[PDB]
Each structure stands twice: as structure tokens, then as C-alpha cells.
């Protein structure tokens with residue numbers, strides 16, 4: 011059975027991705043930072059379905075002097091548990107505003123650029139170095155070119171992740187590793203404010219769900235996507251096409 | 255009952271593979287063709303051997319003219335006549351040849367812009383008016399790094415990106431999704447010399463080979479599926495990384 | 502010897518401002534027009550009062566048809582007959598109106614795709630065949646966030662992006678640069694209610710106002726200048742940030 | 749009163765051409781540099797010979813670190829100290845070298861992402877906070893979506909710079925600060941690159957089969973800071989001779 015690493019897998023979109031990969035027959039590494047109880051509860055659910063098919067792995071993905079070692083350990087945890095690592099899903103992400111005009115700003119850089127871009131880069135390095143249907147899926151943002159007001163560092167990090175997706179697709183193609191993205195628009199919100207976000211969506215008659223994001227990940231890691239690399243699939247209900 | 259799909263230019267090559275995979279997924283299919291009558295009828299015969307009364311052919315020229323709206327309405331009508339419904343439209347048919355800046359030029363406009371853009375637009379209109387509904391447009395992953403001396407073809411494929419996005423927005427309230435699949439190098443021309451085919455294959459980072467028709471069809475199957483119900487206005491490159499390679 | 506420029510749709514609004522600024526920069530100008538004869542002639546008379554024998558008018562319909570290639574050849578020929586050279590082509594003329602998916606539709610195709618894409622292509626062909634040479638195409642900064650029910654217009658503007666890029670590549674060996682200027686909200690219709698105009702103006706981050714025609718013309722002047730001699734295939738948005746604003 | 753500009757990495761090459769053309773347009777200039785002190789001082793001397801007290805140098809490392817915010821604040825402060833105003837910021841300084849996926853990697857992150865993205869962000873913050881024709885120009889890369897093999901961190905940094913350009917254009921528009929980019933394709937090749945390798949790059953360019961001069965890049969910066977660009981914000985102008993349009 012193939013094996014996958016999902017970062018930020020305890021809750022929300024990462025959890026849905028881990029569940030759908032497991033349902034597809036993958037063994038999974040459930041990475042978490044703060045959500046140990048939720049990570050272990052997910053692993054317990056998946057292991058009840060198929061014994062010894064889910065493990066957890068703790069790591070802070072903030073940039074620091076130790077982040078490279080932390081990322082090498084996440085990949086190593088998959089090889090140790092399952093003897094292989096076929097899929098990496100870079101899902102974990104910090105998200106909060108960083109206004110240009112008025113945590114230290116350098117802590118915000120470490121968290122926003124680290125989680126959304128540098129950790130994906132280091133995980134990609136470790137995944138490739140440790141190596142079939144191998145692939146990486148990066149969780150992008152469908153609104154990357156129509157950014158949220160006062161979200162500069164977040165937007166910079168998601169732009170950097172587009173660059174990584176494309177750069178790594180090119181560089182890792184000779185190794186047979188595909189590198190793609192899934193770009194949610196409005197997916198799971200953290201009622202009046204939620205409804206303001208919902209109302210913009212052309213396909214809004216249909217509820218946005220973590221499972222719809224996971225469905226695009228399942229396609230990209232499947233044999234039905236064996237010629238697809240460097241592609242970012244928007245899963246946004248049309249939101250990115252709506253003008254101001 | 256079984257859903258129904260129209261595939262334009264479905265007698266051969268990528269359109270044929272799309273029609274076959276939709277049929278294997280449980281669709282009834284209208285095999286549109288222009289000149290390839292024998293191949294269209296042979297495909298319909300093969301699919302009907304698998305499941306009786308699940309495939310028909312429909313002939314039409316998709317060159318632009320004052321009758322193209324009637325032709326496109328008739329293709330959609332042929333799906334309703336055969337199957338009583340029309341759930342999926344795949345705009346695959348396409349003229350492709352150079353038009354250097356330095357057949358009459360108006361015939362070249364009619365063929366290249368008609369097949370790649372205006373016929374998709376009119377088919378989209380007729381599909382929407384006659385109503386998991388979706389449209390898939392066959393785009394081009396190289397639309398922003400165009401082939402030398404292919405201006406009109408490239409204009410047509412750019413127009414098709416615009417249609418995909420415009421129609422996704424406008425047809426969302428009707429529950430019709432509109433997406434694209436953008437091949438890079440897929441099936442090369444039968445007439446192309448082996449050395450020239452190999453020059454194209456060597457461009458592709460992922461495996462130094464062209465996409466099979468079936469690999470292109472796999473992306474179409476995903477976009478029409480229940481696994482894509484929140485996806486509209488998206489164009490999936492199926493290009494092996496070709497579009498990311500610099501000069 | 503003074504250089505010469507053709508500006509399509511130059512009688513009014515943005516095209517007029519482009520023709521005026523080119524004239525102020527030292528160009529002789531062909532003022533193309535379709536229906537606005539009085540305004541075209543008034544502009545020519547103003548420019549010739551400033552400098553004798555520096556402006557002519559040229560009437561043509563730029564709707565697609567069997568005669569459009571000849572019409573476009575004649576517009577370019579009018580510049581050579583008046584001024585002995587043609588250094589700059591500005592493709593500004595444009596039909597703009599909704600075409601809902603749910604005039605005949607083929608007339609709408611001919612007008613919207615003809616003015617926005619096919620006439621630019623044929624004018625580009627004629628300009629290149631007759632040869633700091635450059636072409637500037639008037640694009641649309643909102644081409645990837647289109648207006649509801651404007652599919653044919655949006656298809657035409659997407660095709661014009663493709664032409665800009667294709668022609669930049671193909672004409673580079675001849676030293677002809679091909680670029681675009683993409684307004685967001687510029688001049689609104691006089692008859693549009695101020696309440697509706699203000700809805701458009703409030704969308705614009707930079708000053709909550711539309712671009713003047715002169716601000717659009719400033720980008721054209723840059724692109725045809727010596728300060729842009731390495732720039733080809735580029736589309737400059739002149740949109741006050743509009744295209745960056747989410748729904 | 750003459751306006752004033754900061755140009756990062758301005759001792760040599762494209763940054764020097766930008767500083768020179770801004771100075772010729774009537775700006776007073778801060779020539780920021782990191783290691784190229786002799787070149788920076790030679791340039792400042794030449795500009796001050798043309799017009800007294802119109803050029804100063806400012807040294808700073810733009811690698812990311814916990815002091816980078818203070819360094820970036822000090823570069824903007826140096827323009828106010830010399831000239832009493834700061835009208836234009838040009839983010840030109842840039843580290844560029846390969847980082848294969850298969851110096852410590854954290855140093856490479858700090859240099860490549862710091863110079864190309866984080867320093868521009870912090871300089872943008874300081875420029876806005878310290879505040880008419882105000883604008884910022886970021887030196888981008890026309891090949892950002894067709895990246896060089898094994899340049900992932902550099903490419904990530906330049907993609908982040910596109911995001912900053914767009915984000916800052918939106919957020920600073922209410923303050924009348926425009927934020928735009930210039931995206932070279934092939935411009936000045938490295939001093940150390942062999943001629944045969946330079947010619948491989950030159951032969952890629954449709955328009956003239958040659959690299960952009962430093963002055964051609966500077967011309968696009970001068971347009972974007974001028975009154976002829978007063979409605980332009982969030983735009984990235986490719987100055988690439990068609991390079992980005994060429995398929996594999």
C-alpha cells in the first residue's frame with residue numbers, strides 16, 4: 011500500500027485529505043503542531059478501519075534554525091512507519107493580517123512565510139532526497155492575484171508556494187515526481203461574516219466543503235493524473251472570476 | 255436513466271478517447287464529426303456493440319458562417335432526439351494550421367476562429383437554452399507561449415479561455431459548470447515525420463513523451479464527475495510540465 | 502521626416518486622446534472612424550490648424566466580413582498615401598455590448614470579434630507587409646474577471662491578447678514591437694446615470710475615479726517611444742488597481 | 749524642491765543605471781549598497797560633481813534576520829536625513845544563485861527570500877510609515893513562471909515579490925502611493941560568465957537576439973515613477989524582448 015504525509019492533518023481540510031487518502035488505500039502520517047488530541051483521535055479512527063495504517067508526527071513548521079531537521083523528521087517518520095513515502099501534501103498554513111501601516115514582524119515572517127512556503131520547500135527537498143506514482147500536492151489560494159486587504163505576508167507566502175510548485179515540478183520531473191497544487195477559494199470558515207463570504211460564490215447554491223478540496227487532491231495523486239505536473243487546480247466555485 | 259454527452263470532433267484521436275471514456279463511465283454519446291464519417295460510424299458501432307442504443311453520429315461543419323448557429327443548435331438537438339437529455343458538452347473539434355502575418359484569409363478566420371471559439375460559444379448557448387451538467391473546452395497549455403506563425407489559431411484558443419471563464423460565471427446560476435483541459439503536446443499528426451515528432455517529445459519534462467489521448471480524456475472525466483462539483487472556470491493543464499520550460 | 506501613425510476609432514474618447522498625444526509628440530496621424538464623421542473631421546481640422554498636412558481621416562467598418570481584409574489594407578495604404586510611411590498602428594476601435602448566453606448572433610460575432618480581434622489581426626498583417634516601428638493594442642484589464650453576459654466581447658479581448666503575443670513573437674525579426682494597454686475603468690458612457698458611474702468609480706483603489714483618456718494615451722506614448730525599445734509582447738494595465746480587487 | 753529616491757543595490761549594473769537616470773530626471777538619490785563600497789562611493793562622487801549634495805550612500809545587509817526591520821527603517825531614514833523627503837523607493841537589490849532540491853539552507857533562505865521579498869516588504873512598510881507623486885518600483889523577473897532549473901528559492905522570492913507588489917498596491921492606494929514592477933528577461937549577464945554562455949542567453953531573445961541594456965531597464969522604472977504613470981498601480985511591465993513568450 012502506498013503512504014502519504016499530510017501536514018496540518020488534525021482538522022478541517024487536512025483532516026478531510028488524510029481521510030480520503032486513507033479511504034483510497036494509503037497509509038498516512040498525520041502531522042500536527044498544537045492539535046495532538048485531534049491528530050491522535052483521527053489516527054485512532056483510521057487504525058480502527060485498518061490496523062497500523064495511520065501514525066502521527068509533531069512538528070512546528072515556523073521557520074527557524076531547526077526547521078530543516080523538523081521537515082526531514084516528518085518525511086523520515088513516513089519511511090519508518092510504512093517503508094516508503096509516495097505522496098506529500100503541503101496543507102499546514104498560518105493565516106492572519108499583517109498591515110503595512112500602523113508578535114514582532116519577524117515572528118510573522120517566520121510563521122507566515124515558514125508554514126506557507128519554506129516548510130513546503132524543505133519537505134519537498136527531504137521527500138525527493140529520500141526517494142511508482144510519486145507526487146506532491148501544495149495547498150495554494152485561488153485568490154492569490156486578488157489578495158485580501160492587509161494580508162501582504164500571507165499573500166507573499168502563497169505566491170512563493172506557486173513558485174515552488176512550478177520550480178519543483180520542473181526539477182523533479184526527471185525523478186518521476188509530479189508536483190501540483192489545489193487552490194481553494196472560500197472553503198471552511200473559522201454567521202453574518204460567514205454569509206458575506208458565501209454570497210460572492212457563483213456556484214454558491216452548493217456548500218463549500220473540505221471534501222471537495224480533498225477530491226481534487228485525490229485526482230492529482232491518482233493514475234488519472236499521471237501526465238499532470240506543475241498544474242494548480244482552482245476549487246473555488248468560480249469566485250476568482252468575479253470582478254469587484 | 256443514463257446521462258448523455260456531446261463530443262465534437264469525436265471520430266479520431268483525443269475526441270475519440272473522450273467519447274470512449276465517457277461511454278465507459280456510463281454516458282450515452284453523440285459522436286460529432288465533419289469529414290471522418292467512416293471513423294465516426296465505426297466508433298458508434300463499437301460503442302453500441304457494448305450497450306445497444308448508446309451512441310449516435312452527428313455530422314456538421316463548425317466553420318463560422320451565418321448557418322453556424324443553426325448547425326450548433328442541431329448538434330444539441332441531436333442529443334435530445336437520441337437520448338432525451340444532454341448533460342455534458344465537450345468542445346474538442348479544432349482546426350490547426352499556420353497563418354503567417356507576412357484558402358482566403360477570411361476562410362482561415364472562419365475555420366480557425368469558428369472551430370476553436372465561435373462554435374464552442376454557440377454550442378454553449380444551445381446547450382444552456384435547451385436545459386450534474388457541465389461543459390469541458392479543449393484548450394491549449396501553450397496559449398501564452400504560442401507556435402510561430404499560428405496567430406489565428408492562438409487567437410481562437412485565447413478566445414476559448416475567455417468563453418470558459420465568461421460562461422462559467424453566467425451559467426453558474428443554472429447549475430452548469432464550465433471548465434477546460436489544456437494539452438501541451440499530445441497526439442502528433444499522422445503525416446508528421448518521425449524526427450519532427452521526436453523534437454516535440456524531447457520538449458516535455460515529465461517523461462520526454464507526448465500525452466496519450468487517454469491521459470487527456472482522464473482530465474475530462476474528472477471535470478464532468480461528482481468529484482469536481484465545486485470546480486467551475488478552471489483550466490487543467492495536462493502538459494507534463496511543458497508550459498513551465500523557458501526558451 | 503516626421504513619423505506617421507494610424508489610430509482606429511480615433512474620432513472620440515480614448516482614440517481621440519491617443520491621436521492628439523501622438524500628434525503632440527510629432528506624429529502625422531490617420532484618424533480612422535466608422536460612424537463619427539463630423540467628430541473625425543473636426544479633429545483633423547484642429548490638428549492641421551496646429552501643423553498643416555499632418556492629419557487625414559479614413560472611414561471604414563471594422564465588422565468582420567469578406568471585405569474586411571481589403572478595408573484594413575486600405576487603412577494602412579491611406580497612411581502611406583498621405584505621409585509616405587507608417588510607423589505606428591494603434592488598434593483602439595471596439596464594439597462593446599452584452600450578448601447573453603440564455604441583431605442576429607452572427608452579426609454580434611462579426612461586430613464584437615471583428616472590431617476587437619480580426620480587424621487588429623488584418624491591420625497587423627497589412628502594417629507588417631508594407632514595411633521605431635510598433636503596434637499598440639487596446640486591451641482590457643478585466644479580461645480574466647469578465648462582465649456578466651459579455652461573453653463575445655470578452656472572447657474578442659482575449660483573442661486580442663493572443664494576437665499581441667503572437668505578433669510580438671513573429672514580427673520581432675522585422676524590428677516591429679507589439680504591445681498592449683489595458684484600461685480598467687476609463688471614460689464611462691455620457692448617458693450612464695451618475696449613480697451608476699459612481700458604482701464603477703468606487704471600485705477603483707487609486708483615487709476612486711476612472712482613468713482619463715489622456716492617462717490611457719500616456720501609456721501608448723510610452724510604448725511607441727524610444728524608452729520602450731526592448732519592450733515587446735507586454736500589456737500594461739492602466740487600471741488604478743481595479744484588477745487586483747476581489748469580489 | 750527636488751524629489752528624492754532610494755535605490756537598493758545601486759552601486760553597479762541595473763541599480764546604478766536606475767540611480768543615474770533618476771538623478772538625470774532631477775531626483776536626489778540614496779545609493780544603497782552591501783559589499784560594493786568603492787563602486788557606490790565612485791557613483792555618488794560622479795552624481796555630486798554634476799549637482800552638489802544630490803547623492804549619498806547607505807550601507808546595509810538585506811539578508812533576513814531579526815535586525816532586518818531596523819536596517820530597512822534606517823535606509824528610509826537615511827533618505828529623510830539627507831534630503832528631507834523620500835518620494836520613490838526602488839527595490840533592486842537581489843541575491844541570485846542555485847539551490848538544488850536534490851552556505852546552510854537556512855542562510856540561503858535568509859539571503860534569497862530576504863533580499864528578493866522580505867527586505868522589499870519591510871522597506872515598503874517603512875516608506876509608507878514615514879510619509880505629490882509617491883511610488884515604489886520592484887525589480888521582478890519576466891521568467892517567474894518559466895523558472896531556471898535548480899533556482900527554487902530565488903524563484904519563490906521573486907514570486908513573493910509579485911505578491912507584495914499587488915498587495916501593497918491595493919493597501920497603499922488610499923495614501924496615494926503607487927506600487928509597480930519592472931520585470932527584466934535577460935539583461936546584464938554576470939561579469940564572471942563566459943562569452944559562449946552569455947551568447948546562449950542572448951540567442952533566446954526574439955527582439956534583437958541580445959540582452960537588455962541597463963538603461964533599457966531603467967527607462968521602464970523612470971516611466972513608472974513619472975506623471976505619465978499616475979493611474980498605474982499594481983502593474984508589472986515586462987522588459988524582455990519577447991523572451992517570456994518563447995516556447996520550449
Ligand SMILES: NC(=O)c1ccc[n+]([C@@H]2O[C@H](COP(=O)([O-])OP(=O)(O)OC[C@H]3O[C@@H](n4cnc5c(N)ncnc54)[C@H](OP(=O)(O)O)[C@@H]3O)[C@@H](O)[C@H]2O)c1
Nearest residue numbers: 018022023042043044045070071072102103149196197198
Ligand atoms: N479555509 C479556506 O477557506 C482556504 C482558502 C484558501 C486556501 N486555503 C488553504 O488550504 C489549506 C488548509 O486550509 P485550512 O483552513 O484547513 O487551514 P487552517 O485550519 O488554517 O490550518 C491548518 C493547520 O495548519 C497547521 N499550522 C498552522 N500553523 C502552523 C505551524 N507554525 N506549524 C505547523 N503547523 C501549523 C495547524 O495545525 P495544528 O492545528 O496541529 O496546530 C492547523 O490545524 C491551507 O494551506 C490554506 O491556506 C484554505
Ligand SMILES: NC(=O)c1ccc[n+]([C@@H]2O[C@H](COP(=O)([O-])OP(=O)(O)OC[C@H]3O[C@@H](n4cnc5c(N)ncnc54)[C@H](OP(=O)(O)O)[C@@H]3O)[C@@H](O)[C@H]2O)c1
Nearest residue numbers: 263267268287288289290315316317347348392439440441
Ligand atoms: N494534439 C495535441 O498535441 C494538442 C495540443 C494542444 C491542444 N490540443 C487540443 O485538443 C483537441 C483535440 O486535439 P486533436 O489533435 O485530437 O485534434 P485534431 O485531430 O486536430 O482535430 C479534431 C477534429 O476536429 C474536427 N474539425 C476540424 N475542423 C473542423 C470543422 N471545420 N468543422 C468541424 N469539425 C472540425 C475534425 O473532424 P473530422 O476528422 O471529422 O473532419 C478532427 O478530427 C483540440 O481542441 C486541440 O486544439 C491538442
Ligand SMILES: NC(=O)c1ccc[n+]([C@@H]2O[C@H](COP(=O)([O-])OP(=O)(O)OC[C@H]3O[C@@H](n4cnc5c(N)ncnc54)[C@H](OP(=O)(O)O)[C@@H]3O)[C@@H](O)[C@H]2O)c1
Nearest residue numbers: 510514515534535536537562563564594595639686687688
Ligand atoms: N472606456 C473604458 O472604460 C474601457 C475599459 C476597458 C477597455 N477599454 C478599451 O479601450 C479602447 C477605447 O475605449 P473607448 O471607450 O474610447 O471605446 P468606444 O468609445 O466604445 O469605441 C471607440 C470607437 O470604436 C469605433 N467602432 C465601434 N464599432 C466599430 C465598427 N464596427 N467599425 C469600426 N469602428 C468601430 C467607434 O467609431 P465611430 O464612433 O467612428 O463609429 C467608436 O467611437 C477600446 O478598445 C476599449 O475596449 C475601454
Ligand SMILES: NC(=O)c1ccc[n+]([C@@H]2O[C@H](COP(=O)([O-])OP(=O)(O)OC[C@H]3O[C@@H](n4cnc5c(N)ncnc54)[C@H](OP(=O)(O)O)[C@@H]3O)[C@@H](O)[C@H]2O)c1
Nearest residue numbers: 757761762781782783784809810811841842887934935936
Ligand atoms: N540581470 C538580469 O538579467 C536580470 C534578469 C531578471 C531580473 N533581474 C532583476 O533585476 C535586478 C537587478 O539585476 P542585476 O543583475 O543588476 O542584480 P545583481 O547585480 O545580481 O545584484 C544587484 C545588487 O544586489 C545587492 N545585494 C545582493 N545581496 C545582497 C544582500 N544580502 N544585501 C544587500 N544587497 C544585496 C548587491 O550589492 P553589492 O554589490 O553592494 O554587494 C548587488 O550589487 C534584480 O532584482 C534582479 O533580480 C535581473
Ligand SMILES: COC(=O)C1CCN(C(=O)c2ccc(N(CCCO)Cc3cnc4nc(N)nc(N)c4n3)cc2)CC1
Nearest residue numbers: 347348349350351352394396438439440441442443446454
Ligand atoms: C498539413 O499540415 C498543416 O496544415 C500544419 C499542421 C500544423 N503544423 C505543425 O508543424 C505542427 C503540428 C502538430 C503540433 N503538435 C504539437 C502541439 C501543438 O499545439 C501536435 C498537434 C496535433 N494536432 C493538433 N490539432 C489541433 N486541433 N490543435 C493542436 N494544437 C494540435 N497539435 C505542432 C505543430 C504545420 C503543418
Ligand SMILES: COC(=O)C1CCN(C(=O)c2ccc(N(CCCO)Cc3cnc4nc(N)nc(N)c4n3)cc2)CC1
Nearest residue numbers: 594595596597598599641643685686687688689690693701
Ligand atoms: C449597446 O448597449 C449599451 O449601451 C450597453 C453598453 C455597456 N453597458 C454598460 O452597462 C457598461 C458601460 C460601460 C462600462 N464601462 C466600464 C468598463 C467596462 O469595461 C466603460 C466602458 C465604456 N465604453 C467602452 N467601450 C469599449 N469598446 N470597451 C469598453 N470596455 C468600454 N467600457 C461598463 C458597463 C450596458 C449598456
Ligand SMILES: COC(=O)C1CCN(C(=O)c2ccc(N(CCCO)Cc3cnc4nc(N)nc(N)c4n3)cc2)CC1
Nearest residue numbers: 841842843844845846889891933934935936937938940949
Ligand atoms: C557565479 O555563481 C553564481 O552565483 C550563479 C549565478 C547564476 N548562474 C547562472 O547560470 C545564471 C546567471 C545569470 C543569468 N542571467 C539571465 C537571466 C536570469 O534571470 C543573468 C542574470 C544576472 N544577474 C542576475 N542577478 C539577479 N539578482 N537576478 C537575476 N535574475 C540575474 N540574472 C542566468 C543564469 C549560476 C552561477
